[model samples]
Target chain A: LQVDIVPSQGEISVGESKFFLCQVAGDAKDKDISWFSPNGEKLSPNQQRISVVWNDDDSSTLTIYNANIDDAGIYKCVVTAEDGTQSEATVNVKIFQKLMFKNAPTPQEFKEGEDAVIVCDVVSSLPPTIIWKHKGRDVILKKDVRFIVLSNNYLQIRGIKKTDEGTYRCEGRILARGEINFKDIQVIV
Target chain B: RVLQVDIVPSQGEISVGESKFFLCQVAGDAKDKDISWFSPNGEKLSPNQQRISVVWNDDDSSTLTIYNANIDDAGIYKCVVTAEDGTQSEATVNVKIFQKLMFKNAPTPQEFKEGEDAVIVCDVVSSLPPTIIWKHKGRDVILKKDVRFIVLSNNYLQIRGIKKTDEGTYRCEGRILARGEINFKDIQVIV
Candidate 1:
């Protein structure tokens, strides 16, 4: 008997769903297949958020819902034929945390000709790229001499003006995972 | 002109329980520049810390020193130089902290029958992978020179066809060349 797993590798963001199909082939008409987690624990259909369903086509499907980091690892499928022969296949799964705002930017009041610093803190399992926009337009730090965005995505306005009094948006993105989050802060002068 | 910022020893690799320092120097039109240091977690480093401190030097530079560093201190550190005009220039230094090599699950004294294969396990753990060497009677056990002994990739010493003369203490040495650290454990085998 031979065991094959569809999509030998998989990656998904947190709170997502993923599934793997394991099929057994050969002249073995009577066979038994089971799924095991990375920790060698046998998986069943009764488990919450995770289930192993046996199909009519000599295949087993392992599905996980709301997957988290702990569910990321190598999952194995073992097939035992009636002739006392066994075959196994494995699939590697990687789960990444979605980009989220740890501390959202709050509305701020700045006096004219005074410096203003808007805070936007983000957290994720992977490194994130941050972008700032003012009134739906990109805030270019180089062109805007008064605006400086720090490495941690904190916007610094050297001299606040009436023109700076508007809605500012902060976007945190993890391009590798195709995940992004946004927060808005109103500035009043 | 833009302010030039550079960090001396852009990459630092230090062993555990050691001290390390990185110098962030600002030059070229940096008269009114303000220098500050940030840790790996992006928190600004201040002068009032137990093991980490930032000291400002008169020569247009700031020094960040970490005393008795641990494994948690390994990462990229940033030093930002902000000029009077709000222009910022930064440099990063990568710090790697290594732990001393040590044995984890070494076997104790054991008795083996003659003509039987004997396996002496040595489990070494460290922040960095260490080179493993087996020694017998205070001498190196070259696997190629002697076919009776085999050292597995996991650093376990295996002896084939054990005999009465093979009854002795075997030593497993773990060495980290970068940190100049070496540790060994002895396991006795009786036939």
Candidate 2:
């Protein structure tokens, strides 16, 4: 019998789940299926968060729930035919994590006309796209003579006026995972 | 190394457009060492921002003064004191104004053809450090393996080649640290 897996390979983030289906071709009816992790350790379908399915089409699905960062590797799906014949398929799972801020932005209160520095620093698997806004409006750093965004995504709104009093927002979207992060400060001008 | 740089008071509450001096106190033998200020992105702040000048006391204690405070200037400031021995010490100050969220460039619903490349964007603009996660309703989005679900620095997800199963309602979650500030967006990809 021939065995196959869908989306043969995939990348996942920590705490996410990945589904690996094993489709067997031929007369492997009523066969028993087992799985092994990357370390050659036998994985039980009966384990919590792990699901196993034996479909009428002779296809079986093995899903590992809440995948950990260390769960990235090749998993072997072993099917034993009643006659001792064994068919196997392998699926690769790679895991990653989102970027974190070593120094994140926080809310601060200021009377009108005080200078401010909005802080933003990050650590990620890749570089991140950063954006800044004020009162849900796009803030053109180069155009707006009132404020400036530092290279690190920090916003510097100089000589804030009553018109400058509103919610200021900063967004950092990590590239690979399509992760979106935000920082907001309420300016009481 | 064995050096100390501190932001006296470490935290400050100020009024908009008003000037405040973050007194960076250094305790080391090397007096003539270079002292500089850095923004969050590893870039150094200019000696002055626009018309206002960044003041350096250069006296018993170091001070970097902002001529005028604004809402956007609220953030963590770092003072780096470099000694003659090449050793450095730094201190961070938390400047506050209020709280808000920004993701003005978030992507909209997009389409792609099977076997063709699919590029989905999640341009989120926020302050502080936020955790980014992509979800699907079944909004299921996984992570990167080279270019598959490839995460790039430009805030995008590039799928080199698309398959029928590579379609779904993608959700992007951004959560800021410490403050627990969060923002969310949904992107629908039709293939």
Candidate 3:
């Protein structure tokens, strides 16, 4: 007996659903098929949020509902034929969390000739690229000696002046996933 | 007037195993001048140094490039410019290299019997200190809210007694808030 699996790899966000289809192609009667989870536990109907259904077309489908990070790993499907032959296939699954801002940017005030710090904190499944903008223009860190951008997404303006009062936007992007989030901080000097 | 020296990208932060470069430009009327680079330890860096190299451009600028940067490469690099008329200027660039957060020695699938105590390990390594959080059934596991659950100083989760209801997958998340980075791992619990 030969076993084939569809979608050898799967990637989805948390709380979504994923299914794997295992089809047996061979001339064998009295076939038995089963699905095992990443932890090597046999999947059964009694399990919550997970189920396996055998189809009449010599195939079986394993479905996971409300998928979580804990559900990520290799899933295997094993088939046993009446002739004592066994076949198996495996598929890998990855689950990611949606990107979000952990803290809101609050209005900041700074006195003249004092340094200003605008904070932007984020939480994401992957490391995000941070960018800072002032008055709808990208803040170039290398252009001015008074401006400094830190790795923590903090924009620092040294010796703040009256002209340095405006709205600053902080953008966090997951380029690989094509996801972006932003927050604005009003600066008063 | 003294020789004017400036460094582009006064501050840089990159991940480990990545590359970065800084430009130091000299702007002055002095046609004959000398430019050199120095490391954080005050040691002079040569143009032929391994992993890091300094290249002088035709536009009176010097570029310092670092390849496959590591933790030790994070520091203040100095660029000094001296003119023939006894005038000098210098600028410093601060470089920070971050090590990606990862699990050091996470635990595997754990099995326990009724009334038995269980411990799930979630040791992590990162450039910055990370905050750890545990989850079960897609929700945060509040250690203080539940007397049966305890979180150790090393970020390990301990269960007072294993029951049938506790049999499932557990997730451990490590977060570097400042850097906005997060990593997690999961382990199955069987009773």
Candidate 4:
């Protein structure tokens, strides 16, 4: 069995390494390598850091080109066979913005004898659960009266009374994990 | 890869011409899983064993749409899903299964004002709305006090006014298909 890099296209996130293998199952006698830019310009010489190797029965290298936002583009590689047939592959590189400190929802104040719904809106969470805490106590969800949590993460309360007044905190519990994030709100009766 | 089958309404009853929906689920990495729906008495309802009218978001789940329920559609339903890895799962459901219920409790709350007939209110909580009977010890309470005695959805028995004869006990009773229960609160209609 002979091995060589196959021509293909792939998408990648920012700063992600792209792996390619060539001459995987056969001898190196029929292997050759070269890469070109989207504009038809050669990259190996201009980009000295990009790697390649001609080893025992394998010619493969992991490429990392000081990847930046502007480096997001398509790349192709060509390998020629002894019979003069050439194969090629293309990769789509992407540079995404790394997430920093996540901000929570704004606080809303509610008074006694009023219906209040405190919403904990998450900008970017895979599967986040927001818990409502009152006076340092977690709220228990029950149906038919008191409160209910909708599928859309809206916390609702009916006919709030004086006892319902307190400082509130929104704690986000990620699905299937213990990592928690929190925000606070204050309500006066 | 594993085939996981599930039946949503596994034992209920529906009237003729009503809509009935069934879900068939299969789990696995490989996409070779298959789903089919079968009637309780042994008959197939889908075209090629493929249920759940359309391929849904998750590969492991599918829905069988019954546009109109009929006599033949009544009874148990079987759902089967198969995985390419040679694994399979099944489920069963009985649609529109019905039954009646009842509730009862002695010593409900009652009160009497110094004048006029003492008022007694009987309240209760039952899963199914039932035919109720209200009695004070041995006598029955007329649909008298429009006020003071309120029967909330939660079966909150209330009594208004204060009198000696109205200090006794009351009862709330009901009858249904299978089983029954009784519960009541105190009636202290003090002056």
Best by DockQ: 2
Report the C-alpha displacement of residue B66, candidate 2, in angstroms: 37
Fnat for the candidates in order = 0.00, 0.00, 0.00, 0.00
Candidate 4 segments whose C-alpha is farther than 4 A from its true place: A1-103, A123-126, A141-144, B1-191
Backbone steric clashes in candidate 3, count = 0
Instruction: Encode model 2's per-residue lDDT on A1-189: one tens digit a residue.
Output: 677777587666566555676767756266777778889987764535655655544666666667676778898888788889898999888875555556764555556687766666765556787777786566883486878778777777787677776777666664343344555766665
Off by over 4 Å in 3: A1-189, B29-32, B84-87, B98-117, B125-130, B143-146, B160-167, B175-181, B189-191
Can you tell me the DockQ of model 1?
0.01
**Which candidate achieves the best TM-score against the true structure?**
3
Clashing pairs in 1: none
Question: Candidate 3 residues A72-129, lDDT tens each?
Answer: 9999999877777888999887887656567755788889899887777777789888
Off by over 4 Å in 1: A26-29, A83-85, A96-117, A122-128, A136-148, A156-164, A172-182, B1-191
Q: Estimate each model's TM-score.
A: 0.40, 0.35, 0.44, 0.28
Candidate 3 residue-wise lDDT at A47: 33
Q: Order of all candidates by DockQ, from best down to worst?
A: 2, 3, 1, 4
**Stretch of 10 with least lDDT, candidate 3 chain B:** B175-184
lDDT of 2 by residue, B1-191 (tens): 36877876677754444444566778877457777876545567777453223446563355555534566767777888878879887888877653234466666677887888777777776445656767666323563333467555665667778876777777676654333244567778888
Please, what is the whole-model Cα lDDT of each candidate in the order they appear?
Answer: 0.79, 0.66, 0.77, 0.50
Model number with the top lDDT: 1
